[PDB]
């Protein structure tokens, strides 16, 4: 597994020893090659994981997450080099260093065998993200956003640490293989109830769960483009991965402790999806669609069935790709008109025909058009929820209807109608932006032909 880690670490001295006008080229090429190397982890077994060493292992759940993480870095570098043009050389290298450190932390987080090491890396991912948001964000709110990002997460994860070192003191180990094999039921007691809460709330805040999702519309909106791309595509999935990993110790306590979270998720799906209908900020609309999509992953993980776990894995990957593409698409317009108001620039299909096609495809994948993997994950979760209770079809059905409404609305407001008369600085699309959209959308469509690669360990 060091054959991926060490090349990623070499991106730092390579970036710092590069010419002033060659950092973007070198970083992009070598991060793409690291993605190529990362593709080898998709060769998974049917029975157990790829146990590289005592420290690192790879499973059918973490391999697609690793591939998405490595694939996202070149796209972030491509999306960042436009608005960082006037920046000094050393600050450009510092921004690229922040991105490389984030990738390194995420790669180790997804493959750590022991839960304390996983916790340390999963918390270390906060520092580069906060620095990115609060140093390179554009507005004065970016400071407050940073605080919201910092303290929502930590207030959730500080109990988790206390739980973890507690568990090792009673079971003897925090190794995930040992934890899974030597698993024992959780009794029905107040102490076990609070241990269950300490093991779960940290991940719930990362998803985030409706009710503790306030930090997200601030952090994603105020962040720079690469910050929001990594926040939506990978950092939200840390909660899903951690919940999937930690659920084994939780049973049979999860059957009754999951009710408040299932109610919050199944209602906040409707709440945030409807919030998207009345949103004057385009980037804020895209951010809220993420909460609406992750409510479904929370439901799938809480109900604890093989179909739900498969659906949650597929939906996490598909949402990562689609939300990253949507944030980039909004940034293309922002770098033209310098405002995130959705109705400021209209009728753009007339002026930018191919970027309109990109918008249409992104909106189609957002509303889970078959046979996209967005739809595969959504439908698997809906089927498992129907098994859990038939009445769920009403809530699930309603969410689907609303999701299509605010997606196409987002399409109709920005692309159709007539272009505003005063704006006259709308330049033709650059090759960089078009390629950035294509490198988002082509892997998404290609994953339809081999969905077993993104369906997790329950396939």
């Amino acid at each position: 597994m060091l054959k991926i880690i060490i090349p990623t670490t070499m991106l730092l001295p390579m970036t710092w020893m590069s010419k002033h006008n060659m950092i973007w080229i070198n970083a992009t090429v070598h991060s793409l090659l690291i993605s190529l190397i990362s593709l080898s982890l998709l060769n998974q077994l049917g029975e157990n994981s790829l146990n590289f060493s005592l420290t690192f292992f790879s499973d059918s759940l973490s391999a697609p997450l690793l591939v998405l993480t490595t694939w996202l870095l070149p796209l972030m570098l491509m999306a960042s080099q436009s608005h960082l043009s006037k920046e000094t050389t050393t600050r450009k290298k510092l921004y690229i260093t922040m991105l490389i450190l984030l990738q390194l932390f995420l790669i180790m987080t997804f493959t750590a065998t022991e839960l304390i090491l996983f916790y340390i890396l999963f918390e270390a991912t906060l520092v580069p993200t906060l620095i990115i948001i609060t140093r390179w964000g554009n507005q004065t709110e970016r400071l407050n956003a940073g605080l919201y990002f910092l303290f929502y997460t930590l207030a959730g994860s500080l109990p988790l640490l206390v739980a973890l070192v507690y568990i090792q003191n009673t079971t003897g180990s925090l190794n995930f293989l040992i934890i899974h094999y030597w698993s024992h039921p959780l009794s029905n007691s107040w102490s076990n109830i609070f241990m269950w809460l300490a093991c779960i709330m940290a991940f719930m805040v990362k998803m985030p769960l409706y009710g503790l999702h306030l930090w997200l519309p601030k952090a994603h909106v105020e962040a720079p483009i690469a910050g929001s791309m990594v926040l939506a595509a990978v950092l939200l999935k840390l909660g899903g991965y951690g919940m999937m990993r930690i659920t084994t110790i939780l049973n049979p306590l999860t059957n009754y402790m999951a009710y408040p979270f299932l109610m919050l998720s199944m209602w906040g799906m409707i709440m945030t999806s409807s919030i998207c209908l009345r949103q004057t900020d385009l980037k804020s609309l895209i951010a809220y669609s993420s909460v609406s999509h992750m409510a479904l992953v929370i439901v799938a993980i809480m109900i604890q069935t093989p179909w739900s776990f498969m659906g949650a894995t597929a939906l996490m990957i598909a949402h990562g790709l689609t939300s990253s593409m949507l944030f980039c698409l909004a940034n293309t317009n922002y770098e033209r008109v310098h405002s995130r108001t959705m109705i400021l620039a209209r009728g753009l299909q007339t002026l930018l025909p191919l970027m309109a096609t990109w918008w249409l495809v992104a909106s189609l994948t957002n509303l889970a058009l078959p046979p996209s993997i967005n739809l595969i994950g959504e439908l698997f979760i809906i089927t498992a929820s129907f098994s859990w209770s038939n009445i769920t079809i009403i809530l699930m059905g309603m969410n689907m209807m609303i999701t299509a409404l605010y997606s196409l609305y987002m399409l109709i407001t920005t692309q159709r109608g007539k272009y505003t008369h005063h704006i006259n600085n709308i330049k033709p699309s650059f090759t960089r932006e078009n390629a950035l959209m294509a490198l988002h959308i082509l892997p998404l469509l290609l994953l339809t032909l081999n969905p077993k690669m993104i369906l997790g360990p329950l396939y």
Binding site: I25, V29, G46, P428, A435, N450
Partner: protein
């Protein structure tokens, strides 16, 4: 002075097409910009997208799906000829199980 400080005016954004009408939007320097475009296109579309997709398509069956199909065919053939049930209700043999003493 009714201004609170000495400050630069906010500068207007630069159009890359003014000096490089075929600008690709990667860099101000035309040569560096063109090589950024070529390197992104080659290493993203030609290498990772095509060769990576081909590599993933032809991955060996380490998930043992064809193996499981073959084993299932073997046991279905064997059981049907024998007249034994196609599938067994209990995965683990009863003889090796020691239930508690009595039902009460």
């Amino acid at each position: 002075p009714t201004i609170r400080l000495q400050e630069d005016p906010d500068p207007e954004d630069e159009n890359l097409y003014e000096k490089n009408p075929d600008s690709h939007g990667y860099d101000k320097d035309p040569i560096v910009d063109l090589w950024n475009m070529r390197v992104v296109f080659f290493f993203g579309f030609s290498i990772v997208l095509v060769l990576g997709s081909t590599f993933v398509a032809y991955l060996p069956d380490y998930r043992m799906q064809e193996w499981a199909r073959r084993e299932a065919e073997r046991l279905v053939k064997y059981r049907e000829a024998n007249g034994l049930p196609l599938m067994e209700s209990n995965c683990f043999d009863p003889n090796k199980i020691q239930l508690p003493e009595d039902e009460d």
